[PDB]
Structure 1
Amino acid sequence: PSPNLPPGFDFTDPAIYAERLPVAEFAELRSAAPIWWNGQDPGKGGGFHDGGFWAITKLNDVKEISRHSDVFSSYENGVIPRFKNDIAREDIEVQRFVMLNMDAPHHTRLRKIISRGFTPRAVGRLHDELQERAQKIAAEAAAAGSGDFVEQVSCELPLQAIAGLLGVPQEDRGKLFHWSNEMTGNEDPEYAHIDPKASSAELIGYAMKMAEEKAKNPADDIVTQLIQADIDGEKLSDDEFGFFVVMLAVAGNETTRNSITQGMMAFAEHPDQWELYKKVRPETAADEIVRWATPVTAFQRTALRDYELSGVQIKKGQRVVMFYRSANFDEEVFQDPFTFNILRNPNPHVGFGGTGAHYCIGANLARMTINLIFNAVADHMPDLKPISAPERLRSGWLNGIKHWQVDYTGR
């Protein structure tokens, strides 16, 4: 029996996500068609013109695709499953210059070098300064009495995480943050005038300038470890470091921001959990926040050969779209998936992707950013209560909140 969905329903349809998360639709697929052909009419495939894709809705299937990188390619069509319908193919393939959209062995070499910048020591060295700024962010917001939680609480700390990871001087962080903000949301009317391409170019130019300067003055930021050759001569060229900085500016910003915003939306909806958090400050909360937020609704892969997955024949060349939003609520993996439980432990969510070659390198940095900001929110604005409904972001694969008016004082 076919799944009870509207005819022509596209799970990457930005017009859906601008209003709601299609939670019931995902649940219907999990029950009636866990791997389902998502057809797309001509010119309505968000940049891809192959007629549709396989909607992947079960956690285990998401994990199987993520593990079998040899079959399910990121490079072939990139991992973002939706752009503007009119995007030029070359503007998709230019994104192959970032680690996210590479296959082995190119990806293998790159992740090995980049790993130097995300060692636990490198991230943990940001703990104290981010905790400081986190406390300052919440106190300044709380003093304002009320405002947009997205902008006064959620936005800054992720941007400062990136800046501190790269050693960007404070005088440059403004433009870094603007470049980062200019690379997501171009399908939402509020961001119709942003130019992700131009900001990428400028960012590359800034990053390459930074690489040659950090070569003359070996600091202790990751930049020196990345452009310094190891015993086998492996390092990032100046342009390779340019693309890595582009990768960081886009990845390190809005996903964590929307985790924070939707973490708090969850807390306002689940007072018992908010109360529990304020007393125990459990760090397991960060993972339940990411599972609940699933800031990346979906990433895609392209099959390099015929492959049978859970009884369905994936054909060579076809796209499979991993709906993390569905997998993170898989009744077969989670006890009470639709209960918000900040003590959930273990929490094998795929908010950071399925385990495999492309698993989020910023996972523990994002977790630390979330734990720090929610401790600060708990310290400074514990009686926060919302004022109006969040404004959702029009995107086909990102789960975003543009705005959320909250009373920080509590009334």
Structure 2
Amino acid sequence: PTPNIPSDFDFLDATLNLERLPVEELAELRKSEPIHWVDVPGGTGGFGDKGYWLVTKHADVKEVSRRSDVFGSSPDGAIPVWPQDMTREAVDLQRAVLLNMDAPQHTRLRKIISRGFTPRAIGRLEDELRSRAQKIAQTAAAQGAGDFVEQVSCELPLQAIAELLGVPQDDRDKLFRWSNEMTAGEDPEYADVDPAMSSFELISYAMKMAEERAVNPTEDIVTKLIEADIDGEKLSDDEFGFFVVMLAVAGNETTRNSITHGMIAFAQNPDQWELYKKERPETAADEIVRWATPVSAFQRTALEDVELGGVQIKKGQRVVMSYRSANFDEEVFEDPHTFNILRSPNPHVGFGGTGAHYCIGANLARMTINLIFNAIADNMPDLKPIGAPERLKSGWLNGIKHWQVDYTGAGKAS
């Protein structure tokens, strides 16, 4: 333990993170106790255990990510914190989707699924997503002022998934509503929704899509995921359904927040925004992800006793990787508190550390970021905030729910 941070301060508490990320407190851990046990003696939400290890240094996050053979994802899932009313049963079945699977099942499925995320499958979407990014940005400009999250940030991540899967235009509204309902989480603005019913309707929709594409193949990835290869490897129709569930939760709010936070960073750093509009540099999307770190943390569970950074971790204890801390590690990044869209090298972990679960959508995500920031630069170069960003109440997803913005930059109607 370390005098500056008492062991009962819970870095993943959703009420705390609603107010602020615990940035200063993470920095004290990096300095003085880089692998730190948090006490939650009355029992953690969902898990029912009495605390967790928090891993705050970049090198150790990469170490945990690389050693999946001792740091598993399936005993407890990757999401590191839940409300007090989450049940152990609801936690235990996160493992129906890729993120929360260990070998051999994860290994087989990730190999199949990687067919969908080649530079070719992703570059094929680029023209359509550019064309959608430009319209999103123009339609929003046309309103003069509004909620930048709903009007600029939200749509392109969901269209990227719709375009990747070849979702019929008439099906997009329900797909998108199921995706948004699925991640209702613990914010009171979303208390009314049914995440499980939404996720059941989505699976059912996706399975029907697999059945159809089996008789009528397409140019989209669905066809490649469900066609047996040399060794008869392919997703079954319900594997495909759980894959679609995976994408809807993996590729929506994460990219949406990288966009919202990127724009906030630009609004706080006008010179970076001038430089952006003028060069469109290729290093910008990665600085945006580092800066947003949309996933603040994900965890593993020790599968046997293991030593890590000189600390003895015992089998069954959770080990939480702070990507928010690691992305500002003073030993890895020069001036980590400067938003620099030319930052290079930029070995951020917003997509995870290299390893079995490294984000499969990462290039699709950078492409989404590049497309919308180009559209914003092209169609609303002078936007300025009218209001404070409102934070999402979550202990692990760095979300912004709303941010009032003047698109014309001069109180204009247009």
What displacement does 1:82 show?
1.3
Distance of 1:135 and 1:235 partners within structure 2: 36
Residues 276-310 of structure 1: CA distance to partner in whole angstroms, max 9, x if unpaired?
A: 10100012110000000000000000001111111
Within 5 Å, which residues of 2 pair with 1:208-223?
Answer: 208-223=207-222
CA RMSD, 1 decimal: 1.0
Partner-residue secondary structure (3-state), 1:357? coil
Q: Deviations over 1:189-237 (max 9, x none)?
A: 1011122111110101101111100111011111101111111111111
| Maintained 8 Å contact 1:391/1:402 | yes
Alignment of 1:177-196 (within 5 A): 177-196=176-195
Contact 1:12–1:396 (CA under 8 A) maintained in structure 2? yes
Correspondence for 2:246: 247
Is 1:186–1:194's contact at 8 Å kept on the other side of the alignment? Answer: no
Tell me which amino acid in the other structure corresponds to 2:329. D
Aligned partner letter, 2:141: A
Q: Where does structure 1 lack aligned partners over 5 or more consecutive residues?
A: none
Q: Tell whether the 8 Å contact from 2:146 to 2:406 is kept in structure 1 after alignment.
A: yes
Q: Residue 297 in 1 paired to residue 286 in 2?
A: no
Partner of 1:200: 199
Q: Deviations over 1:299-335 (max 9, x none)?
A: 0000011111111111111110001000000000000
Residue 84 (structure 1) shift: 2.0
Shift of the alpha carbon at 1:3?
A: 4.2
Amino acid across the alignment from 1:174: D
Which residue number in structure 2 is paired with residue 283 of structure 1? Answer: 282
Match of 2:370 in 1: 371
Deviation at 1:186, TM superposition (A): 2.3
CA contact (8 A) 1:3 1:29 kept: no
**Aligned twin of 2:31:** 31
One-letter code of the match for 2:63? Answer: E
The TM-score normalised by the length of structure 2 is 0.98
Given residue 116 of structure 2, which amino acid in structure 1 is its aligned partner?
Answer: G
1:272 counterpart residue number = 271
1:107 aligns with 2:106: yes
Counterpart in the other structure of 2:5: 5
Question: What secondary structure does 1:82 align onto?
Answer: coil
Q: Which residue of 1 aligns with 2:311?
A: 312
Counterpart amino acid of 1:52? G
Q: Give 1:33 shift.
A: 1.1
Cα offsets for 1:344-371 (capped at 9, x unmatched): 1111000000100100000000000001
For the residue of structure 2 that corresponds to 1:16, the secondary structure is helix
Count of aligned residue pairs for this structure pair:
410
Name the SS for the 2:182 alignment partner.
Answer: coil
- Check conservation: 1:80, 1:300, Cα contact below 8 A: yes
Q: Hey, what does 1:153 align to over in structure 2?
A: 152
Tell me the amino acid that sits aligned with residue 217 of structure 2: P
| CA–CA separation in structure 1 for the residues paired with 2:366 and 2:310 | 36
Q: Does 1:166 align with 2:165?
A: yes
CA contact (8 A) 1:186 1:193 kept: no
Which residue pairs with 1:321 in the alignment?
Answer: 320
Q: Which moved more, 1:186-195 or 1:245-254?
A: 186-195
Structure 2 counterpart of 1:19: 19
Matched AA of 2:99: L
Q: Percent of aligned pairs with the same residue?
A: 77
TM-score (norm 1): 0.98
Aligned-pair distance for 1:185? 3.6
Separation in 2 of the partners of 1:7 and 1:300?
18
Distance in 2, matches of 1:50 and 1:250, equals 25
Instruction: Provide, for residues 129-167 of structure 1, a one-character-per-residue CA deviation record: whole Å limited to 9, x for no partner.
Output: 001100010011011000000010000000000000000
Partners of 2:347 and 2:3 lie apart in 1 by: 27
Q: For residue 41 of structure 1, what is the aligned residue in structure 2?
A: 41
Rate the CA distance shift 1:3–1:377 in 2: closer, same or farther, 3 A. farther
Q: Distance in 2 between matches of 1:147 and 1:272?
A: 24
In 2, the alpha carbon distance for the partners of 1:46 and 1:11 equals: 14
Q: Describe the superposition over 1:358-403 as per-residue Cα deviations: whole angstroms up to 9, x where unpaired.
A: 0000000000000110001001111110011010000011000000
Alpha carbons 1:74, 1:102 under 8 Å: kept:
yes
> Is this contact kept in 2: 1:139–1:380, CA < 8 A?
yes
Indicate conservation of the 8 Å contact 2:210/2:222, yes or no. yes
CA drift of 1:6 comes to: 5.4
* Alpha-carbon offset, residue 7 of structure 1: 6.2
Give how far 1:122 is off: 0.2
Compared CA separation, residues 55 and 3, structure 1 to 2 (3 A): farther
Separation (CA, whole Å) in 2 of partners of 1:334 and 1:150 = 29
